[PDB]
Curated annotation (Swiss-Prot), chain A:
Tree of life domain: Eukaryota
Protein name: Small ribosomal subunit protein eS19A
Source organism: Drosophila melanogaster
GO MF entries: RNA binding; structural constituent of ribosome
Transmembrane segments: none
Pfam families to which the protein is assigned, alphabetical: Ribosomal_S19e (PF01090)
From Swiss-Prot, chain B:
PROSITE patterns (UniProt xref): KH_TYPE_2 (PS50823), RIBOSOMAL_S3 (PS00548)
Species assigned in the record: Drosophila melanogaster
InterPro entries in alphabetical order: KH_dom-like_a/b (IPR015946), KH_dom_type_2 (IPR004044), KH_sf_prok-type (IPR009019), Ribosomal_S3_C_sf (IPR036419), Ribosomal_uS3_C (IPR001351), Ribosomal_uS3_CS (IPR018280), Ribosomal_uS3_euk/arc (IPR005703)
Identification of the protein by name: Small ribosomal subunit protein uS3
UniProtKB keywords: Cytoplasm, DNA damage, DNA repair, Endonuclease, Hydrolase, Nuclease, Nucleus, Phosphoprotein, Ribonucleoprotein, Ribosomal protein, RNA-binding
Gene Ontology MF, one: damaged DNA binding
Curated annotation (Swiss-Prot), chain C:
Subunit structure: Component of the 40S small ribosomal subunit.
Entry similarity comment: Belongs to the universal ribosomal protein uS14 family.
Gene that produces this protein: RpS29
Keywords on record: Cytoplasm, Endoplasmic reticulum, Metal-binding, Ribonucleoprotein, Ribosomal protein, Zinc
InterPro entries on file: Ribosomal_uS14 (IPR001209), Ribosomal_uS14_CS (IPR018271), RIbosomal_uS14_euk_arc (IPR039744), Ribosomal_uS14_sf (IPR043140)
PANTHER family: 40S RIBOSOMAL PROTEIN S29
Origin species: Drosophila melanogaster (Fruit fly)
Binding site for Zn(2+): C17, C20, C35, C38
Protein's UniProt name: Small ribosomal subunit protein uS14
Biological classification of the source: Eukaryota, Metazoa, Ecdysozoa, Arthropoda, Hexapoda
Swiss-Prot record, chain E:
In-chain residues carrying the UniProt-annotated modification Phosphoserine: S1
UniProt GO MF annotations: RNA binding; structural constituent of ribosome
Matches recorded under NCBIfam families: uS10_euk_arch
Tissue expression per record: Expressed ubiquitously in embryos, highest expression is in the midgut.
InterPro entries cross-referenced by the UniProt entry: Ribosomal_uS10, Ribosomal_uS10_CS, Ribosomal_uS10_dom, Ribosomal_uS10_dom_sf, Ribosomal_uS10_euk/arc
SUPFAM superfamilies recorded: Ribosomal protein S10
Species of origin: Drosophila melanogaster
GO annotation (BP), single: cytoplasmic translation
Family statement drawn from the similarity comment of this UniProt entry: Belongs to the universal ribosomal protein uS10 family.
Source species taxonomy: Eukaryota, Metazoa, Ecdysozoa, Arthropoda, Hexapoda
UniProt name for this protein: Small ribosomal subunit protein uS10
Keyword Phosphoprotein: yes
Signal peptide per UniProt: none
Alphabetically ordered keywords of this record: Phosphoprotein, Ribonucleoprotein, Ribosomal protein
Gene Ontology cellular component list: cytosolic ribosome; cytosolic small ribosomal subunit; small ribosomal subunit
Amino acid sequence: VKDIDQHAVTKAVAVFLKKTGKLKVPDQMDIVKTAKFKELAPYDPDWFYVRCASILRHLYHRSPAGVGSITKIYGGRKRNGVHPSHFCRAADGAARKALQALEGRKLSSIGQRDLDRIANQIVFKQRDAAKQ
Amino acid sequence: ANLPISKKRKFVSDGIFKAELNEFLTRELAEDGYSGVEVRVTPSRTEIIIMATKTQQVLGEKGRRIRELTAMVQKRFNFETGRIELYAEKVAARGLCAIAQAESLRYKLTGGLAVRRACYGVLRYIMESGAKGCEVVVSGKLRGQRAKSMKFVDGLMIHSGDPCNDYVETATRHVLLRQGVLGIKVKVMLPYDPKNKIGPKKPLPDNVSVVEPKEEKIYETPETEYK
Amino acid sequence: TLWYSHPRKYGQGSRCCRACSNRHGLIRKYGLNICRQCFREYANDIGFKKLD
Amino acid sequence: SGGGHVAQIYAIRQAISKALVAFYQKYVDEASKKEIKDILVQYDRTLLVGDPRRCEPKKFGGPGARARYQKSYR
Amino acid sequence: SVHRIRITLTSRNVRSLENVCRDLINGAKNQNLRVKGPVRMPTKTLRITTRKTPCGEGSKTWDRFQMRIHKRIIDLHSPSEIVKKITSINIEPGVEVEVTIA
RNA sequence: ACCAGGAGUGGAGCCUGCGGCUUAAUUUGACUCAACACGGGAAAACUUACCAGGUCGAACAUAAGUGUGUAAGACAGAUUGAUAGCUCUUUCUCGAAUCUAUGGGUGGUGGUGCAUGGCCGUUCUUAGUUCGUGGAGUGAUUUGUCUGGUUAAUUCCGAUAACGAACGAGACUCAAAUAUAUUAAAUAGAUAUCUUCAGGAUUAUGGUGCUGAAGCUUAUGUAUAUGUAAGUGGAGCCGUACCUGUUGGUUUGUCCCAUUAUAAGGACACUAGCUUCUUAAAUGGACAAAUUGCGUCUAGCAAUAAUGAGAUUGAGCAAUAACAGGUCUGUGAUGCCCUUAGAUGUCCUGGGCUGCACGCGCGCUACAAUGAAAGUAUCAACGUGUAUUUCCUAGACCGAGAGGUCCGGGUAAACCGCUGAACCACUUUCAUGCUUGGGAUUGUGAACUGAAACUGUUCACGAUGAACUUGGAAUUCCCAGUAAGUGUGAGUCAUUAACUCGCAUUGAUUACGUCCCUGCCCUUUGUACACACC
């Protein structure tokens, strides 16, 4: 949403589908190196679904969130094999099926004013959280 | 025929068609003093405007050599029999255009290094054709095995600036001789402003031509009638 | 039929030099196939004035 | 758009500054246009000067714009 | 019923592009072909760069080659029997007209 | 060229380049500036020139079978690398170009760049050359082409010893800053409102509110959601406008029409979206009496004046004379030399051009806390993309990956693409410890591209963690969006950048000089210097 910056605004929403039982956890959430650049696994799954905040401005300004236009341009800041650093494509995997985690085409049926506005109602409460 | 080809591949497809054409336009029509070809495109046909000097030998007996043009490139480029039209025109002031003069000096060398008989006469002919500046240059093996150059010059040759890319007209020529080869290269300089100058560019390189200050009758006494 | 190998529709051989038939110095891909040293001769009049 | 994570934000300095003048040049008042310049122009950090300093093209024989690489056993 | 015929114009000389708006649009808005003005296209500049010396032995210089292609667009709202005379006249060297029928 | 530095390499591993080594050949051209990630020279075959095996044949007058088959093709077993009836044991055959020893032309990546054409390179980042007409000399040759002042300048005053000269320099051509003031959009859109994508109660609340609202579960039907009651629970519920957001047309707006629907025709705002904007096609554009105790009255810096403009500012361009520079291997550019059924030519199968005790150069990631990780935020631009060739890829889908499937877009301001590039910004894990810095190194499988992958075609995983801790003497590069850091595109490209050209981003330090240094320019002077101090 076009409120205050989405550092923590991503961080809260990651808890809430994790709160609401709509985790829809990939069975290899402790396996994948989330792209062809990482030496180690991620810390956890808490990025893997969280880019709904990114698509809420990308359905707004870029495109209906096709996965090929998704994975290419974000999350590439890489140093690959030593002669020299280059770019990547990040090869997502299971969050192709994170539409099921939400329950010409449109990518979300609840991110119009239905569940994105809940996050706005979270950040309107986060205005009251930041009121002291 | 037509293609879904790109425009940038379309535009260079004209040029590889063009830059091939003036090669063998100098293979055959060097005997008639070939100078240049314009090719335009109108709807439902294209035109080929050849310019040469011996314009009665480009046509031949009973219209054979004109069909010889049309039978060539439609066999070459496989395009429409009828959409290709070739017309040969006369080079105005063959000495002034001078690239045919570069072609004819290959027919002048067989007078036994005919410098004063023929080759220096070309530099006389370019003022007999009435140009502005001129320069020819021949290099090769003369009176001995060693390579050596001459540069007979006459006039003003700019070599620099933008108008050198417009004014001066060079045309190198090669020729086979028994020794081995004499390279022929000519640099001419042509008065593109005054004479008729139908479509050259009508230029103005560096000159400051000054209009007269046009003296006045400062007093201008009334002398006015009332008609 | 016989003694002519090399199914030439892969590799550089043999999509080679449709302006001079000279291999090892080729500009292949602009729709030109020009053998770039011959492109020095035939730069004109296929546009390609130099500017900068 | 364009620019970068430093440069594109510097153009916004020219964005706020000229808008106040033009709204004061025609709509509000001559001196209202005056009173927003004089307090600014003491040093003003060139909030209105659009320097055309853009990048300089390369040269063959180098890696970059004007530098080069040498000592082929000179 | 009524047709809209968009007619693109491509060439290399900008003066010839200044020569086609010299007389085509003026001989058409007398009969009001609805030109919608000279619609400029961004140019398609073509860069090639090559070495100079064959058998590149010495002082590895280069040589840059440029090319400029420009278009300008004339759309018309008229049926096909109107625009037939405009395809005949005026014509221009190096300029190209692209009107499709079917 | 220093200097004041900045970054560097020279140290380390690796990619290459050249050598030397070797080998069947490791094909080669190039060796100070001006050979050395060069020959666009990123090679499995092809390239390929080299090496082994092979293989092909090409002209004619003569001529001799005659057409009792002169030929040419396959099986079959030998020869093979493949069926090369190339050869052949045995077979039939379209038979004639009379398949010739004989003209001799033909090819050649075969030789000479010290026989040449061409181009290109440097001489030289320059500022330098020449000509008629005079006087200077017997003459070579000078003068013009200079004393000084100044210039980037043989650029100009000015001595003015022809000039009006001529080439060079400049002038000129190409690039964002520049009034859209004019017409310019199927780019962008500004907007405007129509909207639709609607939270706040920020608003006003009408109905409602403790009476059970809101919220919640159970049941099955419908193909799990939904319906309802119960379950359930104790304040909110619901509608509008204001505030903040999608969308579609808002093209001569609306309503007209003809039309399937645009327009005007019919009127209204009479403008119910116009051109800021990207795009030009233009002319504007420090367009300089710009004032400044006047320098030889002229080219007295001053920063001062502007307020798109204190050059918007880099490139291209390049004369005379030259070099035994480089290229015969770019070419049907070529002298000559060499060769030709037994090829150096040519196509095939291989091989190699990559091989190694070693030397040398361009260049890559380092040697780490400004850091290596995880995260988040979220800015480019130059470009490029498939109809006689496999391009750009959108979308779904599957797969640790690698990729693969299915279905599109796109011949391109329109699609990939608003290419929403990287480093950097923000919290954490690390706790300097050859560590988690650094990824060479070797196994293994999984892959891709292609007939074919083997000092490898490249690519994935989980191992393997060496050298390497800022690199000696020497030594390169460069003054503003520059240096360097940092990506990306293109070029070659069946797949292969690790290099070369362009592009943008982040953005400094230091000089604003001088002639010690290597320098370079016809001023004077010296000589015993020819091929000129090697």
